[PDB]
């Protein structure tokens, strides 16, 4: 179709941009007038931006590709266990477009 640089771009640029986006709150913990069904929709995804942020702070990833797998896990779980029209899905989709744009610009 260098490891420190990749991981540093993922932390300081990619994650930063998602973290600060206005739709990232369903993908963060804690969740801060939310209805209870919607609270469950958010928290039933076992991957979130917090987990990725901590792994990046604590040198958890041996490869940048392992970081990308966590991101995939997060988006994938959203799409799998919610319906295509759902708010959480459309929000995940906008974050995912931002993620893929920024990933595309990562130095190679």
Residue numbers in the entry: 20, 27 to 57, 60 to 135
What does the study report here?
Bromodomains (BRDs) are protein interaction modules that specifically recognize ε-N-lysine acetylation motifs, a key event in the reading process of epigenetic marks. The 61 BRDs in the human genome cluster into eight families based on structure/sequence similarity. Despite large sequence variations, all BRD modules share a conserved fold that comprises a left-handed bundle of four α helices (αZ, αA, αB, αC), linked by loop regions of variable length (ZA and BC loops), which line the Kac binding site and determine binding specificity. The four helices form a deep cavity that is extended by the two loop regions (ZA and BC loops), creating a largely hydrophobic Kac binding pocket.
The insertions at x3 are present in the N-terminal domain of BET family members. Closely spaced multiple Kac sites have also been shown to significantly increase affinity of the histone H4 N terminus for BRDT by simultaneous binding to the same BRD (Morinière et al., 2009). Recently, it was demonstrated that murine BRDT preferentially recognized diacetylated motifs, whereas most monoacetylated peptides tested did not bind tightly to mBRDT BRDs (Morinière et al., 2009). Recently, it was demonstrated that BRDT requires two Kac residues for high-affinity binding (Morinière et al., 2009). Our SPOT array and ITC data showed that multiple Kac sites are generally required for specific recognition of the histone H4 tail by all human BET family members. For the first BRDs of the BET family, a spacer of two glycine residues was optimal.
